[PDB]
Amino acid sequence: DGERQNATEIRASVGKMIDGIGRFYIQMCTELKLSDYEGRLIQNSLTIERMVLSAFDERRNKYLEEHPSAGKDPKKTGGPIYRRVDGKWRRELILYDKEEIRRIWRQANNGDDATAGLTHMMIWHSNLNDATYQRTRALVRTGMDPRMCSLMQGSTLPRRSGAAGAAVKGVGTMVMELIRMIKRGINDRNFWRGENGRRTRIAYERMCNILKGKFQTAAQRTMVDQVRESRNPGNAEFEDLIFLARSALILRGSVAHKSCLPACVYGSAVASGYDFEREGYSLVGIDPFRLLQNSQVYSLIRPNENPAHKSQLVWMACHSAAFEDLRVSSFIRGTKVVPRGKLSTRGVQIASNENMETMESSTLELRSRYWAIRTRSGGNTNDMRTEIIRLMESARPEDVSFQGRGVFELSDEKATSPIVPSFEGSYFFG
């Protein structure tokens, strides 16, 4: 166990990134003149996060520079801002310089770019999108059946995410990117060749290697290796990739799960005086659960909508429990979790074509009875196509993965005593 130094270094690094994010949000709130209530709005924090993400999108910035937009300059950003006077909420659009946002981000991080914070914000946005909306249209359009949605974790993450974004995204998103590449390859013949051919080939190499590392058992690993070997892949290995994503429902790969909290929680924590540089942090440890335990976040509530359902959606987005079992999610939270079918709430974002006269603000109940450590595994699983098919046959609805690994009480900060759950609906998108 020589990792203690390495683990402490990683904890210090993630704590530094969290502290930088919190101080940046504090600076943005101070400069934008929002009260304590207005600064704690999740919509305002999401708007600020989109501010940062659009400011630092280099490819998008260059695209807007060299193709100008229609009536929208490529130099400034916008975002919905909600402020309260006389008790009533209204939305107004602010215009802020991309250069100013970048300078604020650099200053809040001791003059360092700190792409880790940007990736963390992107992962939080992707988790929110996954927990809120279903992209079955993209599934059906590319040829994959809408039947599988568990593997679509992190499907909204843009390519600018680093290695963490690739690790956190599911097998289905990688397969979707692969099929998009294959479709673009069937479209035209001048592909795989030329100057762009080398770049697209190395991109295929890297994405197929991260899918290589994502998987668990040897037969499906060999299958992904073989479909990689194809120089000019086409329709047969199109169906091969469809089958490979198809087999992931039974023998899943290792997909990372992280607790990416909104910038509002980090800003409130930093405003309280918490210094994550010394105390450390861990995206899979108790720290995010404890931070959510003693943090208050307010959200805009549409008419005839349930605040409890929106709070549950926000909690699942925060903890990336969109595809987590309903029973274990209810046990961890302590309140029975409502699947997406009977969620009487729309998305947390408020559209432009909405009335600023019938909206109310409610506190988000982001409190959980139990806390658990997120696992990046896939579960116990113990020609090659027939071998893979034979593996699915063996699985019975009783195999117990993570044997001896339970949940822990919030007071149990080091996880001395796990709690064994005893076990209705079990699928969020069912």
Binding site: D145, P146, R147, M148, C149, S150, L151, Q153, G170, R246, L249, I250, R252, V255, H257, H319, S320, A321, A322, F323, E324, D325, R327, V328, F331, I332, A372, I373, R374, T375, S377, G378, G379, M392, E393, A395, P397, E398, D399, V400, S401, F402, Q403, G404, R405, G406, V407, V420, P421, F423, S426, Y427, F428, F429, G430
Partner: peptide, 26 residues
């Protein structure tokens, strides 16, 4: 259709459910 099997996020002992009447047949 809908969601089928599961995406293990938390390290808790469980019985990961699947719906064979349609997944096994294809």
């Amino acid at each position: 259709s809908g969601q089928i099997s599961i995406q293990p996020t938390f390290s808790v002992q469980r019985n990961l459910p699947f719906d064979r009447p349609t997944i096994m047949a294809a």
